[PDB]
Amino acid sequence: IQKVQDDTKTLIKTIVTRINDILDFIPGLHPILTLSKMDQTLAVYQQILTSMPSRNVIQISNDLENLRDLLHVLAFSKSCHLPEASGLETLDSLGGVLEASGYSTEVVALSRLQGSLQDMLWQLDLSPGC
């Protein structure tokens, strides 16, 4: 379990760095505290990123899948259950949270995602609920 955590922390830093290389305090999309909320949030970002492919987004999107796995492998070792995340049938509802004047939706989306990732980074050290 500790190595699962070490592997999770590492992968997160990688994605945060990848995003920098590509709004300092922009809140992520409800990135919360339990393993299920983290997973349900990552699932919403994946749907978003799938609608805006680019070299780094496709790269990031793949990493997000590896991060979700690590979150599930953890729940596994914690003998708990992560529900199947709900999916948005449409991204049209995400308009408001992804729209900003002087900023692209791609930039707002990756900026929120980075916020969520940095959020998980420290919360996972508190050995969050399930």
Side-chain angles (χ1 to χ4, degrees), residues 8-39:
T8 306
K9 181 169 295 299
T10 294
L11 176 56
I12 288 173
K13 301 194 199 89
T14 297
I15 310 178
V16 171
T17 291
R18 173 172 295 105
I19 295 169
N20 285 326
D21 300 356
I22 287 188
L23 293 156
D24 284 309
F25 317 121
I26 184 185
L29 299 172
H30 91 104
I32 315 170
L33 28 55
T34 62
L35 298 178
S36 285
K37 286 160 174 180
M38 299 190 179
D39 184 70

PDB file of all heavy atoms in Angstrom, residues 8-39:
ATOM      1  N   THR A   8       1.575   6.675  -6.716  1.00  0.00           N
ATOM      2  CA  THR A   8       0.499   7.619  -7.011  1.00  0.00           C
ATOM      3  C   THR A   8       1.035   9.058  -6.957  1.00  0.00           C
ATOM      4  O   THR A   8       0.823   9.848  -7.883  1.00  0.00           O
ATOM      5  CB  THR A   8      -0.696   7.460  -6.012  1.00  0.00           C
ATOM      6  OG1 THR A   8      -1.129   6.094  -5.988  1.00  0.00           O
ATOM      7  CG2 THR A   8      -1.881   8.320  -6.441  1.00  0.00           C
ATOM      8  N   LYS A   9       1.753   9.369  -5.880  1.00  0.00           N
ATOM      9  CA  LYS A   9       2.342  10.687  -5.650  1.00  0.00           C
ATOM     10  C   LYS A   9       3.269  11.076  -6.805  1.00  0.00           C
ATOM     11  O   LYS A   9       3.217  12.195  -7.334  1.00  0.00           O
ATOM     12  CB  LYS A   9       3.108  10.641  -4.332  1.00  0.00           C
ATOM     13  CG  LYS A   9       3.766  11.931  -3.915  1.00  0.00           C
ATOM     14  CD  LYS A   9       4.268  11.839  -2.480  1.00  0.00           C
ATOM     15  CE  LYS A   9       3.117  11.687  -1.508  1.00  0.00           C
ATOM     16  NZ  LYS A   9       2.209  12.864  -1.581  1.00  0.00           N
ATOM     17  N   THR A  10       4.073  10.113  -7.231  1.00  0.00           N
ATOM     18  CA  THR A  10       4.993  10.304  -8.331  1.00  0.00           C
ATOM     19  C   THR A  10       4.259  10.601  -9.630  1.00  0.00           C
ATOM     20  O   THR A  10       4.572  11.575 -10.309  1.00  0.00           O
ATOM     21  CB  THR A  10       5.858   9.056  -8.507  1.00  0.00           C
ATOM     22  OG1 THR A  10       6.705   8.909  -7.356  1.00  0.00           O
ATOM     23  CG2 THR A  10       6.701   9.138  -9.773  1.00  0.00           C
ATOM     24  N   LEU A  11       3.283   9.768  -9.980  1.00  0.00           N
ATOM     25  CA  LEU A  11       2.534   9.978 -11.211  1.00  0.00           C
ATOM     26  C   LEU A  11       1.857  11.347 -11.225  1.00  0.00           C
ATOM     27  O   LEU A  11       1.805  12.005 -12.273  1.00  0.00           O
ATOM     28  CB  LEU A  11       1.493   8.864 -11.426  1.00  0.00           C
ATOM     29  CG  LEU A  11       0.555   8.998 -12.645  1.00  0.00           C
ATOM     30  CD1 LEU A  11       1.369   9.141 -13.909  1.00  0.00           C
ATOM     31  CD2 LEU A  11      -0.407   7.829 -12.754  1.00  0.00           C
ATOM     32  N   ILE A  12       1.330  11.772 -10.077  1.00  0.00           N
ATOM     33  CA  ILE A  12       0.653  13.067  -9.987  1.00  0.00           C
ATOM     34  C   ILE A  12       1.629  14.222 -10.294  1.00  0.00           C
ATOM     35  O   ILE A  12       1.305  15.122 -11.075  1.00  0.00           O
ATOM     36  CB  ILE A  12      -0.038  13.265  -8.593  1.00  0.00           C
ATOM     37  CG1 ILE A  12      -1.277  12.365  -8.478  1.00  0.00           C
ATOM     38  CG2 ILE A  12      -0.432  14.727  -8.384  1.00  0.00           C
ATOM     39  CD1 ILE A  12      -1.924  12.361  -7.099  1.00  0.00           C
ATOM     40  N   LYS A  13       2.831  14.166  -9.720  1.00  0.00           N
ATOM     41  CA  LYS A  13       3.829  15.211  -9.939  1.00  0.00           C
ATOM     42  C   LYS A  13       4.142  15.298 -11.419  1.00  0.00           C
ATOM     43  O   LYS A  13       4.221  16.385 -11.990  1.00  0.00           O
ATOM     44  CB  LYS A  13       5.090  14.934  -9.123  1.00  0.00           C
ATOM     45  CG  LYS A  13       4.834  14.853  -7.614  1.00  0.00           C
ATOM     46  CD  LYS A  13       6.132  14.927  -6.838  1.00  0.00           C
ATOM     47  CE  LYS A  13       6.001  14.411  -5.416  1.00  0.00           C
ATOM     48  NZ  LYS A  13       6.273  12.945  -5.341  1.00  0.00           N
ATOM     49  N   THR A  14       4.238  14.138 -12.050  1.00  0.00           N
ATOM     50  CA  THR A  14       4.497  14.037 -13.476  1.00  0.00           C
ATOM     51  C   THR A  14       3.439  14.769 -14.324  1.00  0.00           C
ATOM     52  O   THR A  14       3.781  15.520 -15.242  1.00  0.00           O
ATOM     53  CB  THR A  14       4.528  12.573 -13.868  1.00  0.00           C
ATOM     54  OG1 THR A  14       5.613  11.942 -13.187  1.00  0.00           O
ATOM     55  CG2 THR A  14       4.685  12.410 -15.350  1.00  0.00           C
ATOM     56  N   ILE A  15       2.163  14.547 -14.017  1.00  0.00           N
ATOM     57  CA  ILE A  15       1.075  15.180 -14.746  1.00  0.00           C
ATOM     58  C   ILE A  15       1.001  16.687 -14.462  1.00  0.00           C
ATOM     59  O   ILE A  15       0.631  17.463 -15.339  1.00  0.00           O
ATOM     60  CB  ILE A  15      -0.283  14.548 -14.398  1.00  0.00           C
ATOM     61  CG1 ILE A  15      -0.216  13.021 -14.511  1.00  0.00           C
ATOM     62  CG2 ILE A  15      -1.363  15.102 -15.325  1.00  0.00           C
ATOM     63  CD1 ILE A  15      -1.518  12.321 -14.145  1.00  0.00           C
ATOM     64  N   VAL A  16       1.304  17.091 -13.230  1.00  0.00           N
ATOM     65  CA  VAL A  16       1.292  18.497 -12.854  1.00  0.00           C
ATOM     66  C   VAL A  16       2.417  19.221 -13.621  1.00  0.00           C
ATOM     67  O   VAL A  16       2.247  20.345 -14.116  1.00  0.00           O
ATOM     68  CB  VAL A  16       1.502  18.647 -11.337  1.00  0.00           C
ATOM     69  CG1 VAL A  16       1.712  20.091 -10.956  1.00  0.00           C
ATOM     70  CG2 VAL A  16       0.307  18.101 -10.604  1.00  0.00           C
ATOM     71  N   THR A  17       3.552  18.546 -13.751  1.00  0.00           N
ATOM     72  CA  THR A  17       4.699  19.079 -14.460  1.00  0.00           C
ATOM     73  C   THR A  17       4.400  19.141 -15.937  1.00  0.00           C
ATOM     74  O   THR A  17       4.715  20.109 -16.614  1.00  0.00           O
ATOM     75  CB  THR A  17       5.888  18.190 -14.241  1.00  0.00           C
ATOM     76  OG1 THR A  17       6.308  18.305 -12.873  1.00  0.00           O
ATOM     77  CG2 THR A  17       7.013  18.552 -15.194  1.00  0.00           C
ATOM     78  N   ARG A  18       3.792  18.092 -16.450  1.00  0.00           N
ATOM     79  CA  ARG A  18       3.437  18.071 -17.851  1.00  0.00           C
ATOM     80  C   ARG A  18       2.512  19.237 -18.183  1.00  0.00           C
ATOM     81  O   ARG A  18       2.622  19.818 -19.262  1.00  0.00           O
ATOM     82  CB  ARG A  18       2.755  16.757 -18.178  1.00  0.00           C
ATOM     83  CG  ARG A  18       2.173  16.654 -19.567  1.00  0.00           C
ATOM     84  CD  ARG A  18       1.727  15.229 -19.776  1.00  0.00           C
ATOM     85  NE  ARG A  18       2.871  14.316 -19.764  1.00  0.00           N
ATOM     86  CZ  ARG A  18       3.194  13.504 -18.768  1.00  0.00           C
ATOM     87  NH1 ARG A  18       2.466  13.483 -17.658  1.00  0.00           N
ATOM     88  NH2 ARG A  18       4.229  12.688 -18.904  1.00  0.00           N
ATOM     89  N   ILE A  19       1.605  19.570 -17.259  1.00  0.00           N
ATOM     90  CA  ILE A  19       0.656  20.673 -17.452  1.00  0.00           C
ATOM     91  C   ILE A  19       1.359  22.043 -17.400  1.00  0.00           C
ATOM     92  O   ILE A  19       1.002  22.962 -18.144  1.00  0.00           O
ATOM     93  CB  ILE A  19      -0.520  20.618 -16.425  1.00  0.00           C
ATOM     94  CG1 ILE A  19      -1.364  19.350 -16.652  1.00  0.00           C
ATOM     95  CG2 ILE A  19      -1.407  21.867 -16.551  1.00  0.00           C
ATOM     96  CD1 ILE A  19      -2.399  19.054 -15.539  1.00  0.00           C
ATOM     97  N   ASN A  20       2.354  22.179 -16.524  1.00  0.00           N
ATOM     98  CA  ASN A  20       3.112  23.427 -16.431  1.00  0.00           C
ATOM     99  C   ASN A  20       3.773  23.648 -17.780  1.00  0.00           C
ATOM    100  O   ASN A  20       3.551  24.653 -18.450  1.00  0.00           O
ATOM    101  CB  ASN A  20       4.210  23.326 -15.370  1.00  0.00           C
ATOM    102  CG  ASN A  20       3.671  23.403 -13.977  1.00  0.00           C
ATOM    103  OD1 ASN A  20       2.701  24.107 -13.722  1.00  0.00           O
ATOM    104  ND2 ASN A  20       4.297  22.691 -13.057  1.00  0.00           N
ATOM    105  N   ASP A  21       4.540  22.659 -18.204  1.00  0.00           N
ATOM    106  CA  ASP A  21       5.239  22.741 -19.458  1.00  0.00           C
ATOM    107  C   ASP A  21       4.343  23.120 -20.627  1.00  0.00           C
ATOM    108  O   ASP A  21       4.809  23.738 -21.581  1.00  0.00           O
ATOM    109  CB  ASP A  21       6.007  21.447 -19.704  1.00  0.00           C
ATOM    110  CG  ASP A  21       7.035  21.163 -18.603  1.00  0.00           C
ATOM    111  OD1 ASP A  21       7.201  22.006 -17.692  1.00  0.00           O
ATOM    112  OD2 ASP A  21       7.679  20.091 -18.641  1.00  0.00           O
ATOM    113  N   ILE A  22       3.051  22.830 -20.536  1.00  0.00           N
ATOM    114  CA  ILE A  22       2.138  23.195 -21.612  1.00  0.00           C
ATOM    115  C   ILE A  22       2.143  24.711 -21.738  1.00  0.00           C
ATOM    116  O   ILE A  22       2.230  25.249 -22.839  1.00  0.00           O
ATOM    117  CB  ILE A  22       0.698  22.705 -21.350  1.00  0.00           C
ATOM    118  CG1 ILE A  22       0.619  21.189 -21.539  1.00  0.00           C
ATOM    119  CG2 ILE A  22      -0.289  23.417 -22.267  1.00  0.00           C
ATOM    120  CD1 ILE A  22      -0.779  20.637 -21.482  1.00  0.00           C
ATOM    121  N   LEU A  23      -4.624  32.200 -13.117  1.00  0.00           N
ATOM    122  CA  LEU A  23      -5.301  30.907 -12.939  1.00  0.00           C
ATOM    123  C   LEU A  23      -4.525  30.062 -11.912  1.00  0.00           C
ATOM    124  O   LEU A  23      -4.605  28.826 -11.920  1.00  0.00           O
ATOM    125  CB  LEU A  23      -5.342  30.147 -14.270  1.00  0.00           C
ATOM    126  CG  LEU A  23      -6.165  30.675 -15.436  1.00  0.00           C
ATOM    127  CD1 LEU A  23      -5.592  30.129 -16.716  1.00  0.00           C
ATOM    128  CD2 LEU A  23      -7.595  30.258 -15.282  1.00  0.00           C
ATOM    129  N   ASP A  24      -3.764  30.746 -11.058  1.00  0.00           N
ATOM    130  CA  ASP A  24      -2.934  30.123 -10.039  1.00  0.00           C
ATOM    131  C   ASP A  24      -3.724  29.373  -8.994  1.00  0.00           C
ATOM    132  O   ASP A  24      -3.307  28.315  -8.518  1.00  0.00           O
ATOM    133  CB  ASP A  24      -2.111  31.192  -9.312  1.00  0.00           C
ATOM    134  CG  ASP A  24      -0.944  31.697 -10.134  1.00  0.00           C
ATOM    135  OD1 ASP A  24      -0.176  30.856 -10.642  1.00  0.00           O
ATOM    136  OD2 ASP A  24      -0.777  32.932 -10.250  1.00  0.00           O
ATOM    137  N   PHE A  25      -4.867  29.935  -8.633  1.00  0.00           N
ATOM    138  CA  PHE A  25      -5.687  29.351  -7.594  1.00  0.00           C
ATOM    139  C   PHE A  25      -7.049  28.893  -8.048  1.00  0.00           C
ATOM    140  O   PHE A  25      -7.931  28.701  -7.208  1.00  0.00           O
ATOM    141  CB  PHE A  25      -5.882  30.392  -6.512  1.00  0.00           C
ATOM    142  CG  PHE A  25      -4.642  31.126  -6.177  1.00  0.00           C
ATOM    143  CD1 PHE A  25      -4.587  32.506  -6.307  1.00  0.00           C
ATOM    144  CD2 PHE A  25      -3.527  30.443  -5.724  1.00  0.00           C
ATOM    145  CE1 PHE A  25      -3.438  33.200  -5.985  1.00  0.00           C
ATOM    146  CE2 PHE A  25      -2.374  31.121  -5.400  1.00  0.00           C
ATOM    147  CZ  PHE A  25      -2.329  32.508  -5.529  1.00  0.00           C
ATOM    148  N   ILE A  26      -7.237  28.744  -9.357  1.00  0.00           N
ATOM    149  CA  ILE A  26      -8.529  28.337  -9.908  1.00  0.00           C
ATOM    150  C   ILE A  26      -8.945  26.997  -9.304  1.00  0.00           C
ATOM    151  O   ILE A  26      -8.172  26.031  -9.310  1.00  0.00           O
ATOM    152  CB  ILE A  26      -8.508  28.321 -11.463  1.00  0.00           C
ATOM    153  CG1 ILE A  26      -9.882  27.989 -12.040  1.00  0.00           C
ATOM    154  CG2 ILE A  26      -7.528  27.296 -12.033  1.00  0.00           C
ATOM    155  CD1 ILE A  26      -9.877  27.843 -13.555  1.00  0.00           C
ATOM    156  N   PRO A  27     -10.124  26.964  -8.657  1.00  0.00           N
ATOM    157  CA  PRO A  27     -10.605  25.722  -8.041  1.00  0.00           C
ATOM    158  C   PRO A  27     -10.859  24.575  -9.028  1.00  0.00           C
ATOM    159  O   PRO A  27     -11.314  24.799 -10.147  1.00  0.00           O
ATOM    160  CB  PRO A  27     -11.878  26.173  -7.314  1.00  0.00           C
ATOM    161  CG  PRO A  27     -12.318  27.410  -8.063  1.00  0.00           C
ATOM    162  CD  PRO A  27     -11.028  28.096  -8.368  1.00  0.00           C
ATOM    163  N   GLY A  28     -10.481  23.358  -8.653  1.00  0.00           N
ATOM    164  CA  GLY A  28     -10.742  22.240  -9.538  1.00  0.00           C
ATOM    165  C   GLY A  28     -12.228  21.924  -9.468  1.00  0.00           C
ATOM    166  O   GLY A  28     -12.954  22.467  -8.623  1.00  0.00           O
ATOM    167  N   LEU A  29     -12.687  21.067 -10.368  1.00  0.00           N
ATOM    168  CA  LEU A  29     -14.086  20.623 -10.410  1.00  0.00           C
ATOM    169  C   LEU A  29     -14.341  19.722  -9.207  1.00  0.00           C
ATOM    170  O   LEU A  29     -13.989  18.538  -9.221  1.00  0.00           O
ATOM    171  CB  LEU A  29     -14.340  19.795 -11.666  1.00  0.00           C
ATOM    172  CG  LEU A  29     -14.126  20.463 -13.010  1.00  0.00           C
ATOM    173  CD1 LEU A  29     -14.244  19.423 -14.085  1.00  0.00           C
ATOM    174  CD2 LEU A  29     -15.152  21.538 -13.183  1.00  0.00           C
ATOM    175  N   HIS A  30     -14.894  20.298  -8.150  1.00  0.00           N
ATOM    176  CA  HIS A  30     -15.194  19.574  -6.914  1.00  0.00           C
ATOM    177  C   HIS A  30     -14.196  18.455  -6.533  1.00  0.00           C
ATOM    178  O   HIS A  30     -14.613  17.407  -6.037  1.00  0.00           O
ATOM    179  CB  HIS A  30     -16.655  19.056  -6.930  1.00  0.00           C
ATOM    180  CG  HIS A  30     -16.827  17.670  -7.490  1.00  0.00           C
ATOM    181  ND1 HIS A  30     -17.052  16.569  -6.690  1.00  0.00           N
ATOM    182  CD2 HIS A  30     -16.808  17.203  -8.763  1.00  0.00           C
ATOM    183  CE1 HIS A  30     -17.157  15.485  -7.441  1.00  0.00           C
ATOM    184  NE2 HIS A  30     -17.014  15.842  -8.703  1.00  0.00           N
ATOM    185  N   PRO A  31     -12.869  18.643  -6.772  1.00  0.00           N
ATOM    186  CA  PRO A  31     -11.977  17.549  -6.382  1.00  0.00           C
ATOM    187  C   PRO A  31     -12.071  17.442  -4.854  1.00  0.00           C
ATOM    188  O   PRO A  31     -11.615  18.345  -4.118  1.00  0.00           O
ATOM    189  CB  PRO A  31     -10.612  18.059  -6.829  1.00  0.00           C
ATOM    190  CG  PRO A  31     -10.708  19.500  -6.556  1.00  0.00           C
ATOM    191  CD  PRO A  31     -12.064  19.819  -7.148  1.00  0.00           C
ATOM    192  N   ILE A  32     -12.700  16.371  -4.379  1.00  0.00           N
ATOM    193  CA  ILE A  32     -12.892  16.234  -2.952  1.00  0.00           C
ATOM    194  C   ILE A  32     -11.891  15.368  -2.191  1.00  0.00           C
ATOM    195  O   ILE A  32     -10.742  15.241  -2.610  1.00  0.00           O
ATOM    196  CB  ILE A  32     -14.396  15.968  -2.616  1.00  0.00           C
ATOM    197  CG1 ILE A  32     -15.280  16.925  -3.435  1.00  0.00           C
ATOM    198  CG2 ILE A  32     -14.699  16.320  -1.163  1.00  0.00           C
ATOM    199  CD1 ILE A  32     -16.759  16.630  -3.395  1.00  0.00           C
ATOM    200  N   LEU A  33     -12.349  14.716  -1.130  1.00  0.00           N
ATOM    201  CA  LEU A  33     -11.481  13.974  -0.237  1.00  0.00           C
ATOM    202  C   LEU A  33     -11.427  12.456  -0.177  1.00  0.00           C
ATOM    203  O   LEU A  33     -10.414  11.912   0.258  1.00  0.00           O
ATOM    204  CB  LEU A  33     -11.682  14.521   1.180  1.00  0.00           C
ATOM    205  CG  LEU A  33     -13.046  15.136   1.542  1.00  0.00           C
ATOM    206  CD1 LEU A  33     -14.198  14.161   1.279  1.00  0.00           C
ATOM    207  CD2 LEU A  33     -13.037  15.580   3.002  1.00  0.00           C
ATOM    208  N   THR A  34     -12.515  11.764  -0.493  1.00  0.00           N
ATOM    209  CA  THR A  34     -12.479  10.300  -0.429  1.00  0.00           C
ATOM    210  C   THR A  34     -11.939   9.746  -1.736  1.00  0.00           C
ATOM    211  O   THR A  34     -11.848  10.479  -2.730  1.00  0.00           O
ATOM    212  CB  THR A  34     -13.865   9.699  -0.119  1.00  0.00           C
ATOM    213  OG1 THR A  34     -14.789  10.023  -1.161  1.00  0.00           O
ATOM    214  CG2 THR A  34     -14.394  10.261   1.161  1.00  0.00           C
ATOM    215  N   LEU A  35     -11.577   8.464  -1.748  1.00  0.00           N
ATOM    216  CA  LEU A  35     -11.053   7.864  -2.965  1.00  0.00           C
ATOM    217  C   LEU A  35     -12.113   7.855  -4.061  1.00  0.00           C
ATOM    218  O   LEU A  35     -11.798   7.973  -5.234  1.00  0.00           O
ATOM    219  CB  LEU A  35     -10.520   6.458  -2.703  1.00  0.00           C
ATOM    220  CG  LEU A  35      -9.356   6.344  -1.718  1.00  0.00           C
ATOM    221  CD1 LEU A  35      -8.983   4.868  -1.545  1.00  0.00           C
ATOM    222  CD2 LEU A  35      -8.162   7.133  -2.212  1.00  0.00           C
ATOM    223  N   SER A  36     -13.375   7.768  -3.675  1.00  0.00           N
ATOM    224  CA  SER A  36     -14.448   7.764  -4.649  1.00  0.00           C
ATOM    225  C   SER A  36     -14.651   9.116  -5.306  1.00  0.00           C
ATOM    226  O   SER A  36     -14.950   9.164  -6.507  1.00  0.00           O
ATOM    227  CB  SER A  36     -15.756   7.290  -4.020  1.00  0.00           C
ATOM    228  OG  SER A  36     -15.728   5.888  -3.832  1.00  0.00           O
ATOM    229  N   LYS A  37     -14.552  10.205  -4.535  1.00  0.00           N
ATOM    230  CA  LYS A  37     -14.713  11.550  -5.104  1.00  0.00           C
ATOM    231  C   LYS A  37     -13.541  11.881  -6.007  1.00  0.00           C
ATOM    232  O   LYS A  37     -13.729  12.493  -7.042  1.00  0.00           O
ATOM    233  CB  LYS A  37     -14.836  12.603  -4.030  1.00  0.00           C
ATOM    234  CG  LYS A  37     -16.157  12.590  -3.352  1.00  0.00           C
ATOM    235  CD  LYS A  37     -16.056  13.295  -2.022  1.00  0.00           C
ATOM    236  CE  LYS A  37     -17.422  13.441  -1.362  1.00  0.00           C
ATOM    237  NZ  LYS A  37     -17.309  14.142  -0.048  1.00  0.00           N
ATOM    238  N   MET A  38     -12.340  11.447  -5.628  1.00  0.00           N
ATOM    239  CA  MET A  38     -11.157  11.675  -6.445  1.00  0.00           C
ATOM    240  C   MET A  38     -11.361  11.012  -7.791  1.00  0.00           C
ATOM    241  O   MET A  38     -11.202  11.640  -8.832  1.00  0.00           O
ATOM    242  CB  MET A  38      -9.912  11.103  -5.772  1.00  0.00           C
ATOM    243  CG  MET A  38      -9.644  11.751  -4.414  1.00  0.00           C
ATOM    244  SD  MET A  38      -8.060  11.336  -3.721  1.00  0.00           S
ATOM    245  CE  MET A  38      -7.869  12.174  -2.161  1.00  0.00           C
ATOM    246  N   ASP A  39     -11.786   9.755  -7.755  1.00  0.00           N
ATOM    247  CA  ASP A  39     -12.042   8.948  -8.948  1.00  0.00           C
ATOM    248  C   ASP A  39     -13.160   9.531  -9.802  1.00  0.00           C
ATOM    249  O   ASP A  39     -13.046   9.593 -11.020  1.00  0.00           O
ATOM    250  CB  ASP A  39     -12.393   7.515  -8.528  1.00  0.00           C
ATOM    251  CG  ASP A  39     -12.587   6.587  -9.712  1.00  0.00           C
ATOM    252  OD1 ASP A  39     -11.570   6.283 -10.359  1.00  0.00           O
ATOM    253  OD2 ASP A  39     -13.736   6.158  -9.989  1.00  0.00           O
TER     254      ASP A  39
END
